[PDB]
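Predicting holo structure, zinc ion bound.
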Amino acid sequence: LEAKKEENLADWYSQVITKSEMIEYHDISGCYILRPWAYAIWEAIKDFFDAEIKKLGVENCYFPMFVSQSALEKEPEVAWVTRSGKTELAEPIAIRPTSETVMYPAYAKWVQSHRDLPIKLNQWCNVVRWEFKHPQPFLRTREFLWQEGHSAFATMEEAAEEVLQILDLYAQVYEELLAIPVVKGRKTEKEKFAGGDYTTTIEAFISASGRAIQGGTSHHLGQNFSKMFEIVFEDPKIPGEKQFAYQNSWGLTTRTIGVMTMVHGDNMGLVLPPRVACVQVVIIPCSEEDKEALIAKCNDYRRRLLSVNIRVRADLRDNYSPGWKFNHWELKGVPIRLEVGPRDMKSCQFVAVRRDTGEKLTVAEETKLQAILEDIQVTLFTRASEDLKTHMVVANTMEDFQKILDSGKIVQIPFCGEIDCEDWIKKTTAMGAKSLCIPFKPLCELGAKCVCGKNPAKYYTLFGRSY
Amino acid sequence: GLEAKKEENLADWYSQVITKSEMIEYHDISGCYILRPWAYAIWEAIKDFFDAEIKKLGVENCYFPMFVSQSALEKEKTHVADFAPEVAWVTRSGKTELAEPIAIRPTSETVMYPAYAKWVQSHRDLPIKLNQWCNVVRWEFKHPQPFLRTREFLWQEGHSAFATMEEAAEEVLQILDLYAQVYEELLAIPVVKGRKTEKEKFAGGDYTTTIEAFISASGRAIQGGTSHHLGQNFSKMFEIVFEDPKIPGEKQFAYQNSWGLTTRTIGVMTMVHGDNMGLVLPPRVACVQVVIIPCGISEEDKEALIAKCNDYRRRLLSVNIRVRADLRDNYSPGWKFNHWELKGVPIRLEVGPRDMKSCQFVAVRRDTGEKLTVAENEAETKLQAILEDIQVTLFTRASEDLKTHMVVANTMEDFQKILDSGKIVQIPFCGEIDCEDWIKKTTARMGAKSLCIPFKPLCELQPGAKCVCGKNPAKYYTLFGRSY
Ligand SMILES: Cc1cc(N2CC[C@@](C#N)(C3CC3)C2=O)cc(NC(=O)Cc2ccccc2)n1
Ligand SMILES: Cc1cc(N2CC[C@@](C#N)(C3CC3)C2=O)cc(NC(=O)Cc2ccccc2)n1
Ligand SMILES: O=C(C[C@H]1NCCC[C@@H]1O)Cn1cnc2cc(Br)c(Cl)cc2c1=O
Ligand SMILES: O=C(C[C@H]1NCCC[C@@H]1O)Cn1cnc2cc(Br)c(Cl)cc2c1=O
Ligand SMILES: [Br-]
Ligand SMILES: [Br-]
Ligand SMILES: [Ca+2]
Ligand SMILES: [Ca+2]
Ligand SMILES: [Ca+2]
Ligand SMILES: [Ca+2]
Ligand SMILES: [Zn+2]
Ligand SMILES: [Zn+2]
Ligand SMILES: [Zn+2]
Ligand SMILES: [Zn+2]
Ligand SMILES: [Zn+2]
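Done. Tokens:
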């Protein structure tokens, strides 16, 4: 790897994602191939989150990719299919940018009584938003994989409960799987989903860019969509009266992998948190009778490790040098390299090198390796945490806000929350700073006025430059 | 209640069964359907099995883009021209024309193989074995049918490249055998492995292998999955090539395979096993294998009966049986019976107060309807045994059905008679496109298509035997019939 993360972050990022064999470019802008090394991380995320939402009663299903004009405009850079071969469709049809308008008519038909609620459905699928701004692999693409969950309840408080549960699962994905610290909160009036009541969100910070990025989102839709699509049930108490269902929706994408790359990656390449590493430990070999024995010693380690449920690969290819293999698996971010040399074989001991720090370490010919893995995870998280702690500070006045913002940090400011003030904050700080979230647990507690002067502060709000 | 008979109007029965089992919901765009959880969980079971099996072969999962540029789609002879009117084109985003229109993938060769060519710089870069689960689109005007033939559908498509022919040949048959395991072992559906004829194979490939299944309610056959050897056709098209230094001065074009399997599986499961009470789920893929329902419904006694149903639920989960306790006050027990029968749940566990007070329950089989009174303490064992026996039974019945409806015939006379009887036929066949066209055209006065050239035909072909056309010698016994 040539480019340096602190010099030329875009070039560093492209080189990391391709030389780690995560991404390949497609001949259509903003579309990328997810190679197995990237996809396996998505598979790990999927296994965790799918089990967890199943524990909450959510069922998986698959709705059509195509949205009619009427369904879509029953409420915009949607991709329109307008012909098959050379012959025009009777009416153009749209590729889903999200599936509310595909799902909620079906919900309306399935709900007859309050006995039919709640409905909790999730799908793992692809969506398309065909914007013409600059794409970035993983972080912001035209086609992407995600999961979208869509719930409908009889009451408001079970919906609110789910909203917070799903947000906490997203925070778990980032913090426990990817070792990325996030700040939970809710979007401002300006930035919230216009189709919902409130939008909760997890925001992560990428310091090499000094920019924030949304990691996931969980919306309380309230009765907005149920009144739109007539998702109604009869009142269990009052004859002949109908109630509109309360709804949530929530989503999470492969952006995860990009954030994991941006946060933990270094100038040797990818750095994989052991919890999502497709390969946690790579075994590399360093008298011909002796050579055969060495290979057999590696296979011994491999089988043992496989037996202790550690994801492991023995790279015994004859065609490549050990130093080549060292660099290959470092670039890919394998948390531990296990080096087996003849002396050490003879000494019945071995060497383990951790990817995060490079700390080498000799050990006796199972237990240790697992112990190293966990520490690597903790290490990654705590460093990311310190980075966030360094780059997220309080400022009580605009001038202090601006200086700090220009130092490449994100700032919690007292904020009145009006949309006009938020646009003013954007252009005065000019790209300009946007609102990220109103944090659940702000750093310091809030008579204080907004940084606009004209109005009092309603809440500490986190602002920053953002992807 | 279903109130439509499978032996009368098969189409209406199918529609009723897939909707009333809560498998399918209709969409306002023809040929696209909502897969509700009851069916999507069957696809997820198939997925878990096939994923595990291909990983043991060294296949890795990935995800390539859904959009194909016009240049990449039209670049090589990847597919015949007759497919052109069935490609769906995105021509605008919002209100603004795209400079170049882009196509939705009907299959991903034109997206993957330029990448494969970039990735093969030497022998060490082979083999490449990649699979993806994803949706594809084929915008046909022919009458769609849920699960069986739709405009959008879910599938897996595997694409692999090798240094030698032997490796690729081996994988083709391994994957075909995996598809046969999906059908016979998970779905309880017997299939016939074989080779597609010249007319019916994938045109740009060297040969296509296939598994064919029979639907006796319709007298038709349908292809369950496919596994192609491409040889070096696509690698010479896309320049997926390396150099062996021990063979200076010769290119080595990769040998490739591709293979595919869709949600048609579920449709075939519905058509083979479904009866006049609704769906019938093979225990192996049933989302719920056992549903516990309280019957015969004092306040203390009611509390106790519900606790007992939950005891059964706990024990069944603890021995890895997928179980649902239907404890809803809103619906009658006889309605619960009907509802879970429509959905095809293999076993219904009835618990009444008299049975609770004698430590027993009733188990009712979905496939036969047979009722058994079972002692409480044997719940885990008996119920497991019964599930296995349901699986077996379904497969056995279907195989019996296949074996009576597939027979050998040696003349166009016998062939057309047996064909008209609603069966499929293994005939001696010369293999030529003209003569297959002729077989179809004649036997209409729809015509019979070829299904597959079986690896293991019923009867070995006689030497010098001539194909039913009488003009050419038979090259092989070939399974023909009316088809989906
Ligand atoms: C990969 C990815 C992710 C996401 N988004 C959105 C919010 C969200 C979060 N959190 C989803 C709710 C879960 C997320 O991840 C969004 C996107 N593309 C786009 O906006 C389209 C686009 C394309 C090119 C340039 C500019 C914009 N692309
Ligand atoms: C559900 C499903 C399945 C399959 N096919 C194909 C062969 C194969 C097998 N075996 C694939 C290799 C895996 C299969 O299952 C094909 C399809 N639609 C279509 O052709 C498009 C269409 C749309 C409306 C009416 C008629 C035709 N729809
Ligand atoms: O997609 C959403 C709302 C939520 N849906 C379920 C998963 C989580 C997700 O945030 C917001 N959104 C975002 N981008 C969009 C782009 C287009 Br184009 C359209 Cl039509 C609609 C939308 C649109 O509704
Ligand atoms: O899709 C195939 C060949 C194989 N691709 C890999 C997975 C298994 C599959 O059988 C054949 N086929 C089928 N239908 C098609 C429809 C269209 Br539209 C196009 Cl352009 C092309 C095709 C086309 O190539
Ligand atoms: Br969104
Ligand atoms: Br196909
Ligand atoms: Ca055709
Ligand atoms: Ca053009
Ligand atoms: Ca490789
Ligand atoms: Ca030559
Ligand atoms: Zn992998
Ligand atoms: Zn203000
Ligand atoms: Zn289910
Ligand atoms: Zn007793
Ligand atoms: Zn002939």
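Chain A touches chain B through 57 residues (CB under 8 Å).
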